[PDB]
Amino acid sequence: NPEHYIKHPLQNRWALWFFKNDKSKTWQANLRLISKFDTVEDFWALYNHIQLSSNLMPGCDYSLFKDGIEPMWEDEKNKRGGRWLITLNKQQRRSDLDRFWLETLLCLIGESFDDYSDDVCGAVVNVRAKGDKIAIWTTECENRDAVTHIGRVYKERLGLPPKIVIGYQSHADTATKNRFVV
Ligand SMILES: *S(=O)(=O)c1cccc(S(=O)(=O)N(Cc2ccncc2)c2ccc3cc[nH]c(=O)c3c2)c1
């Protein structure tokens, strides 16, 4: 009866990355791999071991990307893509940041975007003095059906009401100008 002793595999292997602003180093040299995991049990062991995003120093990021996709725009799977952006005010660091980030992680490892989960590359949380940000990165900013389905599902999974609109920008523009809004 394998259910007793086998870990539950995830559809993908995922890499969790950490960034801290150290002005002595280049941006790339500051982007650091925490660990990779590919089971439910190993995801929770990692998550239960690390700091909540709300406890990070301003200027730090977490990011979760599929194994083989670097957490930067210049990766082959990111360079033609873009992101759904959640912007948090300073009060939402207390109320929403950690629960929104956990839900984002689960949307990813749980493959919650049906046939379009293959367009997801990863997700990033930025802790910043002027307002935190959470974003889901996807591979192709011209795939309207993929991008808007991901945005509608994501908005629903976060519990955001229709009074809130979220935008999708291509990375080529980021490097707010929206391609899509939901
Ligand atoms: S926010 O904090 O104001 C902000 C502004 C600009 C970019 C970003 S970012 O795209 O989320 N970003 C941080 C990051 C951290 C860890 N993993 C991925 C992304 C970021 C910053 C600088 C970059 C330089 C070059 N290529 C990139 O893809 C970069 C991404 C947040």
From Swiss-Prot:
Keyword match Glycosyltransferase: no
Mutagenesis or variant effect for V40A: Reduces interaction with LRPPRC. Abolishes interaction with LRPPRC and abolishes CCND1 mRNA export
PROSITE patterns linked to this entry: IF4E
GO cellular component: chromatoid body; cytoplasm; cytoplasmic stress granule; cytosol; eukaryotic translation initiation factor 4F complex; glutamatergic synapse; nuclear body; nuclear speck
Outcome reported for the amino acid change (mutating W44A): Binding to CYFIP1 reduced by 70%. Does not affect mRNA nuclear export or nuclear pore complex reprogramming. Does not affect affinity for mRNA cap. Reduces interaction with LRPPRC. Reduces affinity for PML and viral Z protein
Top-rank taxon, per record: Eukaryota
Localization terms from the record: Cytoplasm, P-body; Cytoplasm; Cytoplasm, Stress granule; Nucleus
Primary location group: cytoplasm
Region (EIF4EBP1/2/3 binding): 8-11, 44-48, 103-110
Biological process according to GO: behavioral fear response; cellular response to dexamethasone stimulus; G1/S transition of mitotic cell cycle; mRNA export from nucleus; negative regulation of neuron differentiation; negative regulation of translation; neuron differentiation; nuclear export
Transmembrane segment boundaries: none
Binding-site residues for mRNA, renumbered to this chain: W27, Q28, W73, E74, R128, A129, K130, G131, D132, K133
UniProt key word Transport: yes
Post-translational modification: Phosphorylation increases the ability of the protein to bind to mRNA caps and to form the eIF4F complex. Phosphorylation also enhances its mRNA transport function.
UniProtKB keywords: Acetylation, Cytoplasm, Initiation factor, mRNA transport, Nucleus, Phosphoprotein, Protein biosynthesis, RNA-binding, Translation regulation, Transport
UniProt function note: Acts in the cytoplasm to initiate and regulate protein synthesis and is required in the nucleus for export of a subset of mRNAs from the nucleus to the cytoplasm which promotes processes such as RNA capping, processing and splicing. Component of the protein complex eIF4F, which is involved in the recognition of the mRNA cap, ATP-dependent unwinding of 5'-terminal secondary structure and recruitment of mRNA to the ribosome.
Quaternary structure, from the entry: eIF4F is a multi-subunit complex, the composition of which varies with external and internal environmental conditions. It is composed of at least EIF4A, EIF4E and EIF4G1/EIF4G3. EIF4E is also known to interact with other partners. Interacts with EIF4ENIF1/4E-T; promotes recruitment to P-bodies and import into the nucleus. (Microbial infection) Interacts with murine norovirus viral genome-linked protein; this interaction plays a role in translation of viral proteins.
Family under the similarity heading: Belongs to the eukaryotic initiation factor 4E family.
Protein name: Eukaryotic translation initiation factor 4E
Gene that this sequence comes from: Eif4e
